[PDB]
């Protein structure tokens, strides 16, 4: 549309496009997650719930391979039973909503695999810096 050619606009703007197009615009959805006599309690619990959710996400990233790299290749493989689709098709064919509907079952095992991979990389790096 207006943002054709130079593919960007405001946050949640890429939510309709395919995930390959939406992957180039991730900094703003990361950005619009933190900043934004009894009603002060409501304002305060909203603000601390926002920073608690953001800190939980940053801690979930920080125990994995990437602290703030925002795109992280890692060392765990991919079971093809989970996706069971053509690989380059999903980046030109699927929205992130539809993809999250697809792998709703296949969740929370990936995160433990990531933690095992990161702890294995840490003990391997400890051994490597130990014998040197």
């Amino acid at each position, epitope marked *: 549309a207006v943002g054709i050619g130079a593919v960007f606009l405001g946050f949640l703007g890429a939510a309709g496009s395919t995930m390959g197009a939406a992957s180039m615009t991730l900094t703003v959805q990361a950005r619009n997650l933190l900043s934004g006599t009894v009603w002060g309690i409501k304002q305060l619990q909203a603000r601390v719930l926002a920073v608690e959710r953001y800190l939980r996400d940053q801690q979930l990233l920080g125990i994995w391979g990437c602290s703030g790299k925002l795109i992280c290749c890692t060392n765990v493989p991919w079971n093809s039973s989970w996706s069971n689709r053509n690989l380059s098709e999903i980046w030109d064919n699927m929205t992130w909503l539809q993809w999250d509907k697809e792998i709703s079952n296949y969740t929370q095992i990936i995160y*433990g*695999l990531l*933690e*095992e991979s990161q702890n294995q990389q840490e003990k391997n790096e400890q051994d490597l810096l130990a014998l040197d």
Partner: antibody
Framework: QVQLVESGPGLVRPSETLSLTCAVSGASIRTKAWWSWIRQPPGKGLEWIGY????????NYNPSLKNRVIILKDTSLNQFSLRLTSVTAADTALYYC??????????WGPGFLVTVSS | DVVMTQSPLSLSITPGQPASISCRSS???????????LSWYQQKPGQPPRLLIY???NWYSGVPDRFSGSGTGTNFTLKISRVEAADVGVYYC?????????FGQGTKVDIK
């Protein structure tokens, strides 16, 4: 005082996805424990299928089960479920949910005969 | 994996007389702390088994002291110094120190 009770089929066709679910009362799931599945073919010895943990251990199975077993815990319902994809009629066995603790498998389930038949 | 063997495979008990099962594991079950993760079970038909002795010197809650257990290396020993009619079933020797968990074959025990 822990009580484990299995639930699910006992008669399924081969080459299908088998799934049981054991309910747990008398204690909590997220304990120093491995909520485990152990089977026994009829007239034969036991066969340990695998476990899951109430902490954050990754579940570790018997490699003879050919990576078709996914035990999934349900802490919001105090349960933990066996899975077995692509079953055969030779997989007919009594199934048991149990709890490894500081002692070895104190409270079992009653154990139900899953007779895989076509 | 760990291989378990019980000897004898069948022993019809004489009431008033002891009985024994020698367990043989394939590998050393003594963990580096100093303990031994070995357990004994007793098959009842269509039932969860009855549990006699875990961690050989230790005792289950719910087990009378008319049993006994010892052992060296991989040769462990369950003994019943006074058998009863309540000792029906087919026993088990099962390790717990190595993944994967394994169990045994068992000793057949009936009335003589």
């Amino acid at each position: 005082q822990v009580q484990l009770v299995e639930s699910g089929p006992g008669l399924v066709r081969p080459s299908e996805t088998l799934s049981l679910t054991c309910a747990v009362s008398g204690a909590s799931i997220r304990t120093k424990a491995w909520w485990s599945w152990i089977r026994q073919p009829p007239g034969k010895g036991l066969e340990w299928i695998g476990y899951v943990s109430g902490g954050w251990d990754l579940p570790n199975y018997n490699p003879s089960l050919k990576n078709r077993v996914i035990i999934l815990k349900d802490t919001s319902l105090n349960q933990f479920s066996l899975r077995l994809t692509s079953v055969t009629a030779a997989d007919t066995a009594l199934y048991y949910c149990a709890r490894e603790g500081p002692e070895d498998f104190d409270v079992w389930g009653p154990g139900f005969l899953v007779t895989v038949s076509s | 994996d760990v291989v378990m063997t019980q000897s004898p495979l069948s022993l019809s008990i004489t009431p008033g007389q002891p009985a024994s099962i020698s367990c043989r594991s394939s590998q050393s079950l003594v963990h580096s702390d100093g303990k031994t993760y070995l357990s004994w079970y007793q098959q009842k038909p269509g039932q969860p088994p009855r549990l006699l002795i875990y961690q050989v010197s230790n005792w289950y809650s719910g087990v009378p002291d008319r049993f006994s257990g010892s052992g060296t290396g991989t040769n462990f020993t369950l003994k019943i110094s006074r058998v009863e009619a309540a000792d029906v079933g087919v026993y088990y020797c099962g390790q717990g120190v190595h993944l994967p968990r394994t169990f045994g074959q068992g000793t057949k025990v009936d009335i003589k």
